[PDB]
Amino acid sequence: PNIVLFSGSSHQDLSQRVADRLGLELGKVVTKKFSNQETSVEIGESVRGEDVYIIQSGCGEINDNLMELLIMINACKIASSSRVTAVIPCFPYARQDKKDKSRAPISAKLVANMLSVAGADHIITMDLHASQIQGFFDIPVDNLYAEPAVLQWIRENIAEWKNCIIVSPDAGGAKRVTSIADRLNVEFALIHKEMVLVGDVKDRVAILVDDMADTCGTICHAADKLLSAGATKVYAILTHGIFSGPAISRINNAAFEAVVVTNTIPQEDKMKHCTKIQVIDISMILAEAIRRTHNGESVSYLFSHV
Amino acid sequence: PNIVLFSGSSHQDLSQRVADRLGLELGKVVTKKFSNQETSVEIGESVRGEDVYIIQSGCGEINDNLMELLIMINACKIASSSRVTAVIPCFPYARQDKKDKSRAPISAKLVANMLSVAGADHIITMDLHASQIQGFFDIPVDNLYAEPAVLQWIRENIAEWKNCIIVSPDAGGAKRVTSIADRLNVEFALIHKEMVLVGDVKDRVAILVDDMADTCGTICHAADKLLSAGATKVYAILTHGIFSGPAISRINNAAFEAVVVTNTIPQEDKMKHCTKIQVIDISMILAEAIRRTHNGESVSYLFSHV
Amino acid sequence: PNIVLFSGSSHQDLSQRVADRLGLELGKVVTKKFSNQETSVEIGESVRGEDVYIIQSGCGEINDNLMELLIMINACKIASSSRVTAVIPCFPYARQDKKDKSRAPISAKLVANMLSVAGADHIITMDLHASQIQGFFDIPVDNLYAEPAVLQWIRENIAEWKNCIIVSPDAGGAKRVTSIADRLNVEFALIHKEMVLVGDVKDRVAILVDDMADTCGTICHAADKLLSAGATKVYAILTHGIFSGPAISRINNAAFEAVVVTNTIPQEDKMKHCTKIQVIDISMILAEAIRRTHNGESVSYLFSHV
Amino acid sequence: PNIVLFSGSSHQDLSQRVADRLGLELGKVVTKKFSNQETSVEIGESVRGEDVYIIQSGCGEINDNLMELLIMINACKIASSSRVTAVIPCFPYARQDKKDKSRAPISAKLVANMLSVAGADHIITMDLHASQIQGFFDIPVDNLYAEPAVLQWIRENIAEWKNCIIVSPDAGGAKRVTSIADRLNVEFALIHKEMVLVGDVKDRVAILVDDMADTCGTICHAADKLLSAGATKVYAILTHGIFSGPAISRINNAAFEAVVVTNTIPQEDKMKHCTKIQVIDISMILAEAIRRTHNGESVSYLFSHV
Amino acid sequence: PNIVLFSGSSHQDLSQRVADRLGLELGKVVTKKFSNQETSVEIGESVRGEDVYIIQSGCGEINDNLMELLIMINACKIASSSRVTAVIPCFPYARQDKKDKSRAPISAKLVANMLSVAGADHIITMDLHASQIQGFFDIPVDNLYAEPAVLQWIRENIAEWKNCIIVSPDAGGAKRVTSIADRLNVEFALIHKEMVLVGDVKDRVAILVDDMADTCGTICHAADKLLSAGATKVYAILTHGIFSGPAISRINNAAFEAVVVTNTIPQEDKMKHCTKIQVIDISMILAEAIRRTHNGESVSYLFSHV
Amino acid sequence: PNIVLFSGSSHQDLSQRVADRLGLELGKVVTKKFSNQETSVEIGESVRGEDVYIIQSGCGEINDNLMELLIMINACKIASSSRVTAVIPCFPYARQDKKDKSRAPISAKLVANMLSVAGADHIITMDLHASQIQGFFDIPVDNLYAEPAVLQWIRENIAEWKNCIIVSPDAGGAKRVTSIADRLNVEFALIHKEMVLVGDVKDRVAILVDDMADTCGTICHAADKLLSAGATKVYAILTHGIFSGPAISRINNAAFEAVVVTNTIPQEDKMKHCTKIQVIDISMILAEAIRRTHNGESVSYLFSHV
Ligand SMILES: Nc1ncnc2c1ncn2[C@@H]1O[C@H](COP(=O)(O)OP(=O)(O)O)[C@@H](O)[C@H]1O
Ligand SMILES: Nc1ncnc2c1ncn2[C@@H]1O[C@H](COP(=O)(O)OP(=O)(O)O)[C@@H](O)[C@H]1O
Ligand SMILES: Nc1ncnc2c1ncn2[C@@H]1O[C@H](COP(=O)(O)OP(=O)(O)O)[C@@H](O)[C@H]1O
Ligand SMILES: Nc1ncnc2c1ncn2[C@@H]1O[C@H](COP(=O)(O)OP(=O)(O)O)[C@@H](O)[C@H]1O
Ligand SMILES: Nc1ncnc2c1ncn2[C@@H]1O[C@H](COP(=O)(O)OP(=O)(O)O)[C@@H](O)[C@H]1O
Ligand SMILES: Nc1ncnc2c1ncn2[C@@H]1O[C@H](COP(=O)(O)OP(=O)(O)O)[C@@H](O)[C@H]1O
Ligand SMILES: Nc1ncnc2c1ncn2[C@@H]1O[C@H](COP(=O)(O)OP(=O)(O)O)[C@@H](O)[C@H]1O
Ligand SMILES: [Mg+2]
Ligand SMILES: [Mg+2]
Ligand SMILES: [Mg+2]
Ligand SMILES: [Mg+2]
Ligand SMILES: [Mg+2]
Ligand SMILES: [Mg+2]
């Protein structure tokens, strides 16, 4: 089969970059809405006997884009494609992954089921909120890591990285922080609400590393505790920058040295209203995974380099 | 089990009307959206061992209401309810029911499959675009009719109904038109585009009967053809009035005697900007079907009276 | 994989014609019945890793041919074939496609489910009664059209086709009629029972176009209404000619100029007892669809020519 | 729920007797055929919230009866019944239960899958050809035994039963023969083709016991071998008497003392043309099984008495 | 229906205690092994129309107990029970819940799938390793907490609990520790390998709280780090005490004040060879969940008291 | 794709022999157990886009080996292999294939279902206890025969085979012996318990042929009956030699001329403690089936030669 790369309405810029690294052109698909706000999908080329890849990120209008993804997957399945792969840099409803309330839903499993009945055979995603979402599917699921690119940014941009500290803004983020600290051979701390800090922090550069920042109610309160606790400068490094609601107003009025995110969510608009925001490119990692999945090579090689 | 009636964000007024006819109160559910525009559903009462009935219409913002419905169904299924029934007065994506294009989707079947994997056991809907959507499910599906209420309106409001004529604005609507005409003993006509009229029409009160009006393009060119053909006055009777886009601007600048719709879609806002719009209450037919499904009575009795 | 063409008991002549156009030979299968009237299927060649195509029409004795088809599909699936495609020129139980009665079945969906659990991956059919039966399956379904061959016959055989009129014998057949009329730039009419005619007809050659004729209770009554309404000669063009029951006795005692059908159902025996019956060959359209599905070409090209 | 007993076109008499033993009336269902030989099913009462039982035997026109059964099960399932039980005294396609040929089907598993996807929840059958057809299903399957009635008939009718012999006409029927012989405390023999006899037989009454007799090509050659081997009189006892093909011509021209069968298949017509045929009533056992399944009693009690 | 309580080979003592709180007798089931070490299950009562509950913990020989559970669930499903619930205090293969290696299995999802196809409808478990295993099922899953009983033990036994500290032996156990600290209004610490401690712990009683201890390689190294860091006495509180391999030899040769575990795994043999081990009874929490699930009461009430 | 041969813990010697006939090396997989006796599976090569074959026999610790098989199948399915085939020379739980008791399980169907949800696409086995287990799967199942190798052994080793007799130790084994007798043109006998013998036996060499011997409470008592009935010497030929429990002590204390088995179960340890045991190599038949399934050749050719 031949790679047929398709792009949804969300994050059109990343799909163009992945096409460039793969050395191909995006497929002909027109995705608009009808008068009554119903998704319209018009694929403009034959997907018969092809390896269709669709890039759709859980950003912007989550529900509008999610239905767009399911209609595109189902259209390519009935149009007699060979395999259909959903490339989702940010997984929607990933924070609703367990039932710790009375009648709470598990919306991550509902989205997993809906992608399965549309007809997707493979899933490629980056830095899932819970790694266990891989078990919500009966199909192969790729969970790429942005950590090798995060480590590269720290070494080149922060000069004092050899004698810095790494801070976790939440109790559940200690797994991510401890892995990064060992790779840099530095110390680490942890911040818990209900604000308590456990770690030296004083008179050293502190880096806040999390997986996502929706409204930045965290990290911004964490930065105040870090500056009150003796740290000189504070850095914030994140993978998925949603920056919804106040968010930008909190970052613009905070004392972060820099806020660093990836390409998983469109950052072009947010970067106009915040000079602290910096972006790490991940289109190289996504293009390599699509390349190796198509050719039947080892994706495990990606978890050994940048 | 006990009836537990829930209402989604869409069409809150009909759910209250159905609750009054059933003589109960709506269940405690809070449906908001998070900062990143993700649906939040919080059921505030035990649904364990209950007959849950969720009323959600495919109107307004379709994709956000549809994802609202699936989260509510899945939450009630995992919360150990006895049965879950989706009451959907207007079915979303009902116009995409076949594949007559190159790589077209069938989004009616995708929506059908999503309701199945959420965990719905029964579907109650009214006046489907295609009756064959009943076969898109492997569960019982109820297809109610607004025709008995349509015929009741004609007999009381139009005085010349004994010598009127029903006009079909399209070629695919001849099934509805001929059934109505035979039930009234009056003649019928038909209008086809690419605009042609077959039927007397001249010096007679013409009634345009269709199942739906989205942008009212068809019921506007048809009305102009009817007034140019000799009909004194033109009436339009519809079941699902979406009235999206121009729609209202076309109805206000038209020569309809009246435009008549049902409760399936909220008409309170549209009736302010158009005096030609009239509403037929259908909350009694929905309440009776919910009542009879719970009590194990014959729903076929509904198709013999009003 | 290699095409392996198999033929069921029904319509052996079309399978031979399709084999000739494809330039191959029919596979070795022996289908008889045991003493207790149970279907016996004996495939006499290896189907391992092959693209199996089974041609079975819903004609003759429906239930014995339908069980024949399911046994053949299941035998080829367990025999490790690559893909199995059911080519069904006339779909059985296509008229039971909805539930508009008290405890009516939907037998079109039951037959759809049986073909799925036998192991079919693709369905190729022509001129379904309802196009929505495509959504009764979760697999690709091809719905071919006999209209390009219908229009070709009219142009060469009826000399007055430039000033003729197409008549719909029922209210639900107005979709086929209006599409044909626009493609010929001529007018159209419509006949409804409970018998009333709308259209000129008078002093014009009327053509009755329908999708199928089982007992010819319709068209035969329509022709009488057309001859009493001023039409000179009446033609009838149909896709699936079952001609069961009286049928032939009604056609022989009618005033049709000609009755025209296709190859979907065996017409060799019926043509002996009726001289008005003419046949349109469709073995080229079926062979092209089989050829293009195997080669991964565009079947949409078939809906642009003859 | 309430028992709703339905009867298919096959074996109306057994259904009437089962209704009599249960003290109820058969449900209102009309099952005829259309002009093109398609099954028509018209249930004439509400099955909503009921325990529907359908009695259909695999006899006569096997395929038409099987389609009838599937259509009835699906109609009762979609019509919102509580449970649907298929009571099948003789299972169709039970002899095709394994793949011992090149591309042979396993039609028993296909029938099992079709019954599963129609919507049946329970299966009640008597004396399956292979007991593993119980494992062909994912639902409960009852396999009743006619052996107690066979033993009762042997005791009351044959006077010399205390010093008789029991003969198996095939190598695969040695299990039934050994079980019956042990229950009667008599000896046993076996007959194999490719005819060889292993047993005394000489100067004693020999009883041929099998599970079914389709064409009676066996048992007749077995009877000739037994009469040539020194046995005085030969009896034949069977469970399912199909008697298709020559069958009756072979029994009338044979030297059986009596041929004894059960009610699983209609026997009145065959009993008209053969004086040797005798029938054992099994309606009591089926009625008891239905009664105990409805009331949630122990069906295992039936395998301890008559 | 009626509660039918069944017990597997593993942890026979807890099943007896749960039966006593529910005020009933355990069901009659004999579970032995054949000569070739295959599980034999012999239920000695009618489960027809009953609410069957089976108590089986993932301890001892995991694979023999897991196959025992599936055979009991499947036997009770085919025996026409009403509902089947698996009560699993310790879930097997809970630590293999994600794919973070080259070709790693996710054996938690395989066990989830094998419980689904056996026929279980509900799962009751306590303190899952990952809460997300709830989403590995499409059925309701109860995740009980042993924390309220853990808090009761600390207050009753440790006198210095008002000025103690809670220590996490791993980076991933920070979620449990921070929640317990807030409930007691005390401080907390964290220990990470690759052994580094963050927190005071000097001159105060330190409590190590985890979810399970398999070989006690952790907690034993953590205790050495705590005692050399200035802590006075060290306590270890765990939920699932496996104590496999050396385990006991490490606890007997350590400086724990006490090792406290729950009833999820049999502890009677371990406490003979270790005086430091203490058991917390949870048979009241399991009995209440079983009682409330059967009666259709709120299980959420259990997460507000002891 | 490429053949990737994997071996489980059970029967490492047969896998090596099959690898040699196929001319390849076994795949890199390490299978051990954790401290708490849970299966660990670590594949050391890329199975991506490969035809994976796993050889695992139902011997030794059945439950440990069965869970090992499912973990290996599921790991290779999620690792994006092309096809996964389970080669099982001896099928676990094959004797529990029907429900002839009150609440008996059918554990052969449970094992079939667990192999289906792990992700296996093909099953290769030898001499199933019941041939109908092929219908317990919805996937192709190969049922190889050891009979051609059994016939070869008799002709080469037993000199009196031309005037010998074949004895079946059970009523259910008459199918095997009658087929073997016809291929040798010799006589046959049968032994039934509740011990009675039918057949000459006297003054001739008797061969006892069965499918398996677990504990030899079967042939051993049959051999005693044969020697007291006049047979000169007794041979025992079996396919699956389990030899569990007493087994060997009964064979060592019996009067068998020889006990002959196959490679389906490891025999190396048994032949140390029994000189009567002889082994027939079947690694050539398994290698040919694996070779032909991969290459898409006819497996039916194997049932015409050795
Ligand atoms: N899009 C969203 N925006 C804000 N909150 C969300 C969103 N989706 C889910 N949530 C809520 O946020 C909570 C996330 O909790 P989390 O910090 O992940 O707990 P833990 O750290 O124990 O996993 C969930 O309980 C969920 O109810
Ligand atoms: N550190 C890691 N090394 C290798 N794989 C990892 C790692 N972390 C997570 N994974 C997961 O393991 C999977 C390995 O991909 P897979 O296709 O099995 O590799 P291969 O091509 O060698 O079979 C990836 O999809 C990834 O999600
Ligand atoms: N004119 C009609 N009369 C009766 N039923 C109809 C009609 N039109 C459609 N139906 C369908 O028939 C179904 C009858 O409901 P059902 O529960 O089967 O009736 P009962 O309660 O008698 O079993 C309805 O769900 C409806 O969708
Ligand atoms: N007028 C039409 N033009 C194109 N396709 C049509 C038309 N009418 C119906 N169809 C449906 O569209 C499908 C197109 O086949 P498909 O394999 O999707 O095309 P492609 O090979 O270009 O992907 C056909 O199976 C047919 O059923
Ligand atoms: N001799 C036998 N005794 C009991 N059951 C048998 C026997 N032979 C076969 N069976 C099977 O065992 C099943 C027992 O039915 P079941 O509903 O499990 O009994 P209970 O009502 O006691 O649970 C029957 O359906 C029958 O098919
Ligand atoms: N703190 C908590 N409060 C309530 N429920 C919780 C909590 N933590 C987890 N849960 C989960 O919520 C579920 C509530 O059970 P459910 O049957 O929904 O209760 P109800 O009967 O009120 O609907 C439990 O199964 C449990 O797994
Ligand atoms: N005597 C026999 N001859 C041929 N096939 C047999 C015989 N006995 C059993 N079989 C079954 O028939 C199957 C034939 O395999 P299959 O893949 O259909 O062959 P082919 O490649 O010729 O289609 C085997 O899997 C086997 O289980
Ligand atoms: Mg979380
Ligand atoms: Mg339409
Ligand atoms: Mg129709
Ligand atoms: Mg047989
Ligand atoms: Mg873990
Ligand atoms: Mg057996």
Numbering used by the authors:
A (entry chain C), B (entry chain A), C (entry chain B), D (entry chain E), E (entry chain F), F (entry chain D): 2 to 195, 205 to 316
The article reads:
PRPP synthase (PRPS) transfers the pyrophosphate groups from ATP to ribose-5-phosphate to produce 5-phosphate ribose-1-pyrophosphate (PRPP), a key intermediate in the biosynthesis of several metabolites including nucleotides, dinucleotides and some amino acids. Although hPRPS1 and hPRPS2 share 95% sequence identity, hPRPS2 has been shown to be less sensitive to allosteric inhibition and specifically upregulated in certain cancers in the translational level. As a rate limiting enzyme, the regulation of PRPS is very complex. hPRPS uses ATP or dATP as pyrophosphate donor and can be allosterically regulated by inorganic phosphate Pi and ADP.
Here, we find that hPRPS2 can form filaments in vitro, and the structure of hPRPS2 is obtained by cryo-EM with 3.08A resolution. The twist and rise of hPRPS2 filament are 30° (left-handed twist) and 63 Å, respectively. The hexamer of hPRPS2 had D3 symmetry, there were 6 active sits (ATP and R5P binding site)and 6 allosteric sites in a hPRPS2 hexamer. Here, we solve the human PRPS2 filament structure with ADP binding in ATP site and allosteric site 1 and Pi binding in the R5P site. The ADP in the active site can interact with three monomers, which means hPRPS2 needs to be assembled properly to function. ADP in allosteric site also interacts with 3 monomers, and it formed hydrogen bond with regulatory flexible loop (RF loop Y94-S108). Each interaction site contains some identical amino acids. hRPPS2 hexamers are connected by salt bridges formed between R301 and E298 pairs, the hydrogen bonds between R301, N305, and E307, and also the van der Waals’ Forces between R302 and R301. When incubated with allosteric regulator ADP and Mg2+, or ATP, R5P, phosphate and Mg2+, or PRPP, phosphate and Mg2+, hPRPS2 could form long filaments, and the mutant hPRPS2R301A and hPRPS2R302A lost its filament-forming ability. The enzyme activity results showed that the mutant hPRPS2R301A and hPRPS2R302A almost lost its activity. K99 in the RF loop may be a key amino acid residue related to the allosteric inhibition of ADP.
